[PDB]
């Protein structure tokens, strides 16, 4: 049983790359700068003590000031050299720190892309925004505070213990040890209490800000129902709660600082009083008193932030463990063990006794079996909740069937590589998304090495090349958010051009026209009929009139195949498809 | 320059609430605690200097050991009392600070709700989240640093100048003043340079995080086209750019700290050398050396944060000026001074020669005039660019016509109060949004004092009460984002129930069923026909079959009224409406 250390040890390869010489040399130089700065900050109070002694004794300077002048100049130069070494170590190590955190983030990103519905379960705007906005900052803060506050403070504490032992290590060493122990214990307990209060304050702040954002984003609704006063009172109550929580949190912070100062000042009083008492017996000089003062101040100056340091290090460790846990996530999606590549020569589709559900307590597909001939035009229709979008998702193997299988060209898609499987399939879903880039990039996204000629051919096949030609920047016009806005038909056409760039043998149109206007619907339906020239096409449409010209139609009811056949045959059977068509006919 | 001064002058009423009591006593107590803490931190180095003097001389009315012990105990007690006074001032002032920031945020929110057009111009995704998350933070840090670091430092600097003059020579004062001036100047220049580099770093960080979020949110699309490697490389390039920018920023911070330490330690060397030189000539005592040391350290330790303080003060002033500008924003559509409340006795609608456009360079409504009789069921149809949603928006007076007007019950809507006008109108738009709360709240949002019984009646009239009854938590079920997800039909039903709770005499259905399924479409169309019992109803639909039963049909083309009449009459006319109906016949 062990954590924390384990986590830091897994992180250490990122800090210690063993692939970049320069970075290891920089880590060594940073440690050397740590040592130099600590040595200088320990040496300068000795210089101050010797200057004071020269002012109170005769020393080795005949005017006695020369030694004092030299030593006060040495004290000032030591302060400057300590700060210089600290900033030099920061400068040298910052590159290694940034590179380590960047590599960790890249690994987490690459693993996230491999997870496949670990997100479909949780894709809340708040969760995504919070995670992606916090991840790097938490680690940066934890790493910096740990490496450049705990280790330097530990080194300084050990060196101060040694020096304090050599020079009256009878009682002051015990006193400083007791003071450090009490300080750390009190800081830790009060910091845990303060972290509880801080979490409550942060929750209230998030609630108030979320209420404000929801109000401003729904301004149209507020005006529609005249709820300005109600929303104002709501936000005012939330802000009052947040203010009370913040007041209590800052009062707890004040108590923490008061206790810290009490401990520190008790140690200072004891040490200085004991030192001057020893001076009265002639044991020690006054420079020893100033020495003790400066040593204690230099020791406890980093510990002033100790509560914040502890809290931030804890949070960073938690978040780093979270990142490693995300990396150590099993991929339920595909087995693909030594899988051979899928070779689609005749693009047929087979559903063999497919039984599937999202959760074990509810069941969707009760043994659905059907055949889609290669090159045929097939439609998939059904009422709400029929599960045809689940058919679309299972064809791409977003899930694996519990009891059944899916075949492409007669080959089970569960036994082939995901790359070859998804390379043979193109899909245009109901809600098509555009990347935040130029139209040229959005169209070329279909294939990696996509050339300009292929992009032009796809824009021509999607009947959108003329629309792009009329744009001022042409293919370099940025679309999506923070860019040029496109109509729903334009988004669907860009998606069609993307899938054409991909050029897959099998195509799925999942309610492509479900939210377009009738003119645009007819235009893009003609475009889709044109694009279905030499491909196997499956059109999952809600409106039956849009797919009446299909080679065959599959009617789904309650997750099973109720009816199959051509439009005229299904109408003549006077069944479920005929009932739906009759309802929609007028 | 002077904008920050005007900003602080505008803020001062919030900090010092002239017309307000008790919080002013809190402010006075906080200032008194500031004064006590500064006095104690100035007094303790005198105790240290006198302790050193007692240790270096052999005289004194009382035993040198007694006086030395008393003075070191006084020094420790002064340190403790200074920290105690600082924490007490923080605790006392936190209430006033939180209340002032809350009142500022409330005023900004209230003024933001009283603006109509500027929302659409500023709807960027990062825009809203960034401003809402950052405004209060910026104000808080700037206020804290100003009131508790700069002003105490100014008091301490004046007191240190006075004490150095009274107890030391004109030259120590001259040197410390020149050093403070050089420190401030260097800090200012380097902090401006650092703010430039830091802004570049933040922009690159935002770009990298936005790329990561866009990749992860479009995971389905990335899998559709097998672009995992491309997305990884894009994120890696963005992260490398961000890492380089961060490295340069932290190197600039190191340079700033190096310059600050150089100035401070040059002043320290000069002052200490001058003090020991004056002591060697008998001008000053040896305790004066430690006195000067402690005074300079206590003065310049808070100035270590001067760069961050300056940057935060600048950002807070900018953001506060921006908030005050938001409060001092002119309303486009403002009420007339003595506007009477709208009295709807006969809910007719009249558009007389309405000419309107969003921008003066483009024009949408080319003098549209029409009459909607009270209690009648009217439909408004047209192509995608006809501009009928602009009719819907102008009915609610989101804008004012350029040349023309709109009447409700014979009264110009531009001459009545906005509240009564919008209270007399209810609207169900195509994309209805839910507030982040329970369904009971989402339905009761129609009216302020909406009861649970009114919610039940509205859910019954919207044919959604049974759907809510089958939910486990019933009306207390949280819906919308970060909650239970509802289908488009369910959201439209909740919106209809909301408008029913409002119970307005005039209803507008703006393409409410354009994205619903057929069974839900028929159910919600029957619901709309039912709820139109004693109300004037205007149904703006693109699909003619959904509004064929309307009393009359208004056909819009190119922003003008092309055809008017009933469904049968317009079909008989064989015009534009007949052409659209024939095209849709399918
Ligand atoms: N992420 C999910 N978690 C749980 N249940 C789901 C999820 N997605 C879909 N379902 C359920 O599975 C069913 C699948 O039907 P669906 O494919 O949506 O039909 P259609 O394609 O006609 O809308 C739906 O009724 C829905 O209730
Ligand atoms: N906020 C806006 N600023 C500028 N132009 C707009 C804005 N909103 C819409 N438009 C343009 O004005 C026209 C208004 O049409 P609209 O009434 O939205 O059509 P519909 O009634 O079919 O929704 C649209 O063609 C659109 O291009
Ligand atoms: Mg679907
Ligand atoms: Mg509209």
3-state secondary structure A291-357: HHHHHHHHHHCHHHHHHHHHHHHHHHHHHHHHHHHHHCCCCCCCCCCCCCCCCCCCCCEEEEEEEEC
Sign of the alpha-carbon torsion through B185, B190, B192, B195? negative
* Residue at B333 is within a domain: no
CA B119 from centre of chain: 13
DSSP element (H, E) containing B354: strand B349-356
H/E stretch holding B539 reads strand B536-540
- B566 C-alpha to center of ligand 2: Å? 26
CA B41 from centre of chain: 39
Q: Are B239 and B177 in contact (CB under 8 A)?
A: no
Distance from B59 to chain A by nearest Cα, in Å? 13
DSSP letter, residue B478: B
- The residue behind tokens 């933040």 is B202
* Rounded Cα gap, residues A507 and A425, in angstroms: 6
The two beta strands, B552-557 and B377-381, are parallel
Shortest Cα–Cα distance, B101 to chain A (Å)? 9
Q: CA separation (Å) from A213 to A221, B127, B194, B411?
A: 13, 11, 32, 35
Pairing relationship of beta strands B506-510 and B349-356 according to DSSP bridges: unpaired
The answer on B356 and B308 residing in a single domain is: no
The sheet with strand A349-356 has its strands ordered as A365-372, A349-356, A403-408, A411-412
**Bridge partners of A378?**
A538, A552
Identify the CA nearest to B566 among candidates B550, B582, B577: B550
* Domain boundary pick from B267, B296, B328: B328
**Which residue from A5, A17, A9, A25 is spatially nearest to A103, judged by alpha carbons?**
A17
Question: Are B309 and B217 part of one and the same domain?
Answer: yes
Number of Cβ within 10 Å of residue A148's Cβ equals 18
Q: Which two structure tokens, joined as six digits, stand for B410?
A: 């014979």
CA B239 to chain centre: 28
- Scanning the structure block, which residue is given the tokens 């044919």? B463
Question: By the CB < 8 Å criterion, does B66 face chain A?
Answer: no
Is B408 a domain residue?
yes
The C-alpha atoms of residue A108 and residue B239 are separated, in whole angstroms, by 13
- Enclosing H/E stretch for A582: helix A576-585
Residue A324, CA distances (Å) to A108, A177, A340, A364 in order: 8, 37, 31, 35
* CATH number of the domain within which A365 lies: 3.40.50.300
Q: Please judge whether B220 and A63 are an interchain contact, meaning their C-beta atoms are less than 8 angstroms apart.
A: no
Is B337 a member of any domain?
Answer: no
Residues 525 to 554 of A: which have CB under 8 A from any B CB?
542-543, 545
Distance CA A334, CA A328 (A): 16
Give the number of domains in chain B.
2
Residue B285 three-state SS: coil
A contact test, residue of B204, B243, B567 with most A CBs within 10 A: B243
Instruction: Determine, yes or no, domain membership for A343.
Output: no
Residue with tokens 């206590």: B298
The pair phi, psi for residue A99, each rounded to 5°, is: -65, -40
- The tokens for A443 are 């169209």
Report yes or no on B165 lying in a domain. Answer: yes
Q: Are A247 and B95 in contact (CB under 8 A)?
A: yes
A378 and A245 part of one domain: no
Q: Is B392 exposed, middle or buried (0-12, 13-18, 19+ CB in 10 A)?
A: buried
What is the separation of C-alpha B283 from the centre of its chain, rounded to a whole number of angstroms? 61
Q: What's the domain range around B521?
A: 349-585
Residue of A nearest to B395 (CA): A224
What is the spatial distance between Cα B450 and Cα B444, in angstroms, rounded to a whole number?
5
Task: Test A226 with B257 for CB contact under 8 angstroms.
Answer: no
Give the number of whichever ligand sits closest to the CA of residue B487.
Answer: 1
- Tell me which residue of A281, A322, A519, A575 sits closest to B382, measured CA to CA: A519
Residue B211: HSE in the Cβ half-sphere, 13 Å Cα cutoff: 22
Among the partner residues B124, B133, B586, nearest to A545 by beta-carbon distance: B586
Q: Does A57 touch chain B (CB under 8 A)?
A: no
Assigned token pair, B485: 């997800």
Q: How many residues comprise chain B?
A: 586
The experimental resolution of this structure, in angstroms, equals 3.7
Let me know if A30 is exposed, middle or buried by CB neighbors in 10 A (0-12, 13-18, 19+).
buried
In the reported structure, the alpha carbon of residue A412 is separated from the centroid of ligand 3 by a whole-number distance in angstroms of 23
CA angle A50, A170, B50 (to 5 degrees): 45
Instruction: Give dist(CA B293, CA B291) in Å, integer.
Output: 5
Q: How far apart are CA A465 and CA A468, in angstroms?
A: 5
Structure tokens at B9: 């002058």
Do B315 and B358 lie in one domain? The reply is: no
Residues A317 and A363 in one domain: no
- Which residues of A fall within a CB distance of 8 Å from B238? none
**How many CB atoms are located within 10 Å of the residue A532 CB?**
18
- Maximum Cα–Cα distance for chain B, whole Å? 123
Taking the C-alpha atoms of residue A561 and residue A404, their distance in angstroms, rounded to an integer, is 15
User: How many C-beta neighbours within 10 Å does residue A574 have?
Assistant: 10
> How is residue B561 written in tokens?
């009224």
B196 is in an annotated binding site: yes
Cβ atoms of A382 and A563 closer than 8 Å: no
- For residue A447, which phi and psi values (nearest 5 degrees)? -135, 150
DSSP A149: I
Q: How far apart are CA A117 and CA A359, in angstroms?
A: 13
Annotated binding site of A for glutathione: 194-198, 257-260, 304-307
Question: Running DSSP on this structure, what letter comes out for residue B209?
Answer: H
Tokens 């700065």, located at residue: A37
Q: Copy the structure tokens of residue A343.
A: 């070779």
- Say if ligand 2 is within 6 A of residue B533 CB: no
Please give the structure tokens belonging to residue B202.
């933040």
Residue B439 near residue B491, CB atoms below 8 Å: no
Q: Which two tokens stand for residue A576?
A: 């479920």
Residues with Cβ within 8 Å of residue A149, at least 6 apart in sequence: A302, A305, A309
Length, in residues, of chain A: 586
> Which candidate from A239, A447, A514 shows the least CB-CB separation from B106?
A239
The C-alpha atoms of residue A215 and residue A209 are separated, in whole angstroms, by 10
Nearest residue to B131 via CA among B319, B296, B4, B409: B319
Output the DSSP codes for B32-100.
HHHHHHHHHHHHHHHHHHHHHHHHH----SS-HHHHHHHHHHHHHHHHHHHHHHHHHHHHHHHHHHHHH
Orientation of helix B2-15 relative to helix B306-327, angle to 10°: 80
Instruction: From A436, A581, A475, A463, select the one nearest A531 (Cα to Cα).
Output: A463
User: What is the distance in angstroms between the Cα of B361 and the nearest Cα belonging to chain A?
Assistant: 19
Has residue B335 been placed in a domain? Answer: no
**Are residues A445 and A435 in contact, defined by beta-carbon separation less than 8 angstroms?**
yes
Sign of CA dihedral A433, A437, A443, A445: negative
Residue ranges of the alpha helices (H) in B449-562? 452-461, 465-469, 488-502, 518-531
Q: In this complex, how many residue pairs, one in chain A and one in chain B, have their CB atoms less than 8 Å apart? A: 317
Q: With 0-12 CB in 10 A as exposed, 13-18 as middle and 19+ as buried, what is B111?
A: middle
CATH number at residue A318: 1.20.1560.10
d(CA B90, CA B148): 8
Alpha carbon of residue A144 to chain centroid: 20
CA of B15 to the centre of ligand 2 (A): 45
Cβ of A393 less than 6 Å from ligand 1: no
* A335 is a domain residue: no
Is residue B404 marked as binding? Answer: no
Q: Does residue A430 sit in the same domain as residue A571? A: yes
B557 sits in which H/E element: strand B552-557
Locate the chain B residue with the closest alpha carbon to A521: B584
| Structure tokens, B109 | 């929110």
Give the pairing of strands B506-510 and B377-381.
Answer: unpaired
Q: Which atom of ligand 2 is nearest to the CA of B387?
A: 17
Positions of E strands within A413-505 = 425-428
Cβ atoms of B398 and B116 within 8 Å: the answer is: yes
In 3D space, the residue among B143, B131, B127 whose CA is nearest the CA of residue B90 turns out to be B143
CA atoms within 13 A on the CB side of B549: 8
Q: In what order do the strands lie in the sheet with B365-372?
A: B365-372, B349-356, B405-408, B411-412
Distances (CA, A) of B109 to A231, A298, B114, B335: 10, 48, 9, 19
The beta-carbon neighbor of B232 closest among A91, A98, A109 is A109
Beta carbons of B297 and B42 less than 8 angstroms apart: no
Kindly determine whether residue A261 and residue B215, on different chains, have CB atoms separated by under 8 Å. no
DSSP B384: T
Contact criterion met (CB below 8 Å) for B174 and B158: no
Pairwise CA distance, residues A321 & B84, whole Å: 38
Q: Are strands B560-565 and B552-557 parallel, antiparallel or unpaired?
A: antiparallel
**A537, A540, A544, A550: CA torsion to nearest 10:** 10
In angstroms, the first-to-last Cα distance of chain A is: 71
Contact call for residues A358 and A559 (beta carbons, < 8 A): no
Query: A283: number of CA atoms within 13 Å, CB side?
Result: 11
Half-sphere exposure of B174 (CA within 13 A, CB side): 4
**A516, A488 Cβ separation under 8 angstroms:** yes
Q: Are B310 and B420 contained in the same domain?
A: no
- Whether residue B443 sits in one domain with residue B414: yes
Closest C-alpha to A427, from A276, A292, A528: A528
Return the structure tokens found at A555: 């009617």
Query: What token pair was written down for B58?
Result: 């052999």
Q: Which residues pair with B354 in a beta bridge?
A: B368
d(CA A467, ligand 2 centre) in Å: 19
Say if CB B280 and CB B96 are below 8 A apart.
no
Between CA A76 and CA A71 the distance in angstroms is 9
Determine, for residues A106 and B254 on separate chains, whether the beta-carbon distance falls below 8 Å: no
The C-alpha angle with vertex A309 and arms to A303 and A315, in degrees rounded to 5, equals 160
* Two tokens, residue B213: 């979020």
Shared domain for B271 and B356, answered yes or no, is no
3-state secondary structure of A565: strand
CB contact under 8 A, A232 and B481: no
B330: Cβ contacts below 8 Å, ≥ 6 apart: none
Please say whether the dihedral angle defined by the alpha carbons of residues B131, A488, B235 and A399, taken in this order, is positive or negative. Answer: positive
d(CA B353, CA A417): 65
C-alpha neighbours within 13 Å on the C-beta side of residue B337? 0
Per the listing, tokens 């005007």 go with B6
Experimental method, per PDB record? X-ray
Interface of A with B in 327-366 (CB under 8 A): none
The verdict on A435 and A567 lying in the same domain is yes
Please report whether residue B339 resides in a domain: no
Residue A383 CB neighbour total at 10 angstroms: 16
Residues B306 and B269 in one domain: yes
Question: Which is nearest to B556 in space by CA: B353, B404, B370?
Answer: B370
Taking the C-alpha atoms of B381, B383, B385 and B390 in order, what is their torsion angle to the nearest 10 degrees?
10
Q: Does A76 share its domain with A185?
A: yes
């Amino acid at each position: 049983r062990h954590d924390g250390w384990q986590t830091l040890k897994r992180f250490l390869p990122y800090l210690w790359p063993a692939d970049n010489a320069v970075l290891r040399r920089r880590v060594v130089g940073a440690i050397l700068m740590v040592l130099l700065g600590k040595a200088t900050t320990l040496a300068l109070p000795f210089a101050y003590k010797k200057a004071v002694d020269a002012m109170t004794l005769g020393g080795g300077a005949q005017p006695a000031l020369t030694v004092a002048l030299a030593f006060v100049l040495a004290y000032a130069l030591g302060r400057f050299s300590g700060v210089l070494f600290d900033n030099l170590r920061n400068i040298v190590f910052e590159r290694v720190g940034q590179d380590a955190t960047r590599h960790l983030a890249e690994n987490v990103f690459a693993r996230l892309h491999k997870l496949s519905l670990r997100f479909h379960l949780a894709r809340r705007t708040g969760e995504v925004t919070k995670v992606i906005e916090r991840g790097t900052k938490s680690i940066d803060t934890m790493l910096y505070f740990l490496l450049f506050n705990i280790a330097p403070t530990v080194i300084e504490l050990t060196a101060v213990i040694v020096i304090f032992w050599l020079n009256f290590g009878l009682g002051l060493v015990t006193a400083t040890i007791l003071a450090v122990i009490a300080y750390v214990w009190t800081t830790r307990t009060i910091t845990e209490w303060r972290t509880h209060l801080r979490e409550k304050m942060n929750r209230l702040d998030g609630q108030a800000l979320a209420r404000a954002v929801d109000s401003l984003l729904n301004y149209e609704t507020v005006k529609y129902f005249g709820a300005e006063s109600r929303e104002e009172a709501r936000y005012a109550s939330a802000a009052r709660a947040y203010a009370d929580a913040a007041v209590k949190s800052e009062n707890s912070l004040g108590l923490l600082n008061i206790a810290q100062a009490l401990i520190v000042n008790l140690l200072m009083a004891g040490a200085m009083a004991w030192t001057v008492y020893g001076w009265s017996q002639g044991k020690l000089t006054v420079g020893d008193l100033v020495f003790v003062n400066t040593y204690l101040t230099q020791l406890f100056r980093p510990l002033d932030m100790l509560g914040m340091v502890y809290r931030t290090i804890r949070q960073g460790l938690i978040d780093m463990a979270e990142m490693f846990r995300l990396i150590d996530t099993h991929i339920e999606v595909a087995d693909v063990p030594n899988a051979p590549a899928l070779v689609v020569n005749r693009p047929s589709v087979t559903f063999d006794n497919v039984v599937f559900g999202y959760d074990r307590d509810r069941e969707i597909l009760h043994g659905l079996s059907f055949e889609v001939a290669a090159g045929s035009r097939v439609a998939i229709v059904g009422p709400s909740g029929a599960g045809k979008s689940t058919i679309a998702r299972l064809l791409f193997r977003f899930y694996d069937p519990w009891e059944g299988r899916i075949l492409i060209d007669g080959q089970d898609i569960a036994h082939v590589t995901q790359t070859s499987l998804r390379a043979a399939l193109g899909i245009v879903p109901q809600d098509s998304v555009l990347f935040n880039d130029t139209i040229g990039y959005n169209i070329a996204y279909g294939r990696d090495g996509a050339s300009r000629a292929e992009v032009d051919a796809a824009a021509k096949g999607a009947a959108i090349a003329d629309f792009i030609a009329r744009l001022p920047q042409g293919y370099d016009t940025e679309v999506g958010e923070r860019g040029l806005k496109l109509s729903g038909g334009e988004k669907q056409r860009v998606a069609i051009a993307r899938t054409l760039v991909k050029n897959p043998p099998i195509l799925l149109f999942d309610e492509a026209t479900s939210c377009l206007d009738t003119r645009t619907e007819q235009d893009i339906l003609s475009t889709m009929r044109a694009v279905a020239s030499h491909r196997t096409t499956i059109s999952i449409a809600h409106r039956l009139s849009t797919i009446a010209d299909s080679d065959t139609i599959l009617v789904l009811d309650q997750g099973r195949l109720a009816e199959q056949g051509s439009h005229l045959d299904l109408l003549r059977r006077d069944g479920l498809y005929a009932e739906m068509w009759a309802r929609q006919a007028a």
